[PDB]
Chains A and B, each alone.
Chain A
Amino acid sequence: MVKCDPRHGKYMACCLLYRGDVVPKDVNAAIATIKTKRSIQFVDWCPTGFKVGINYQPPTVVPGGDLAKVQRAVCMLSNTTAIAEAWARLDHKFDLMYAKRAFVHWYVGEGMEEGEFSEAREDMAALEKDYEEVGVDSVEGEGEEEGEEY
Chain B
Amino acid sequence: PDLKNVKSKIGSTENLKHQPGGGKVQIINKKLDLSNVQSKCGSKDNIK
Contacts and interface: CB of A to CB of B under 8 A. Distances in A.
Interface of A: 98-101, 117-118, 121-122, 125-126, 129-134, 136
Contact of B41 (A100, A118, A133): A133
Interface of B: 29, 31-34, 36-42
A103 B39 CA distance: 30
Contacts of A122: 34, 36-37
A118 to B, nearest CB: 5
A134 B41 contact: yes
A118 B37 contact: no
A98 B32 contact: yes
Which of A101, A117, A132, A133 lies at the interface centre, i.e. has the most chain B CB atoms within 10 A of its CB?
A133
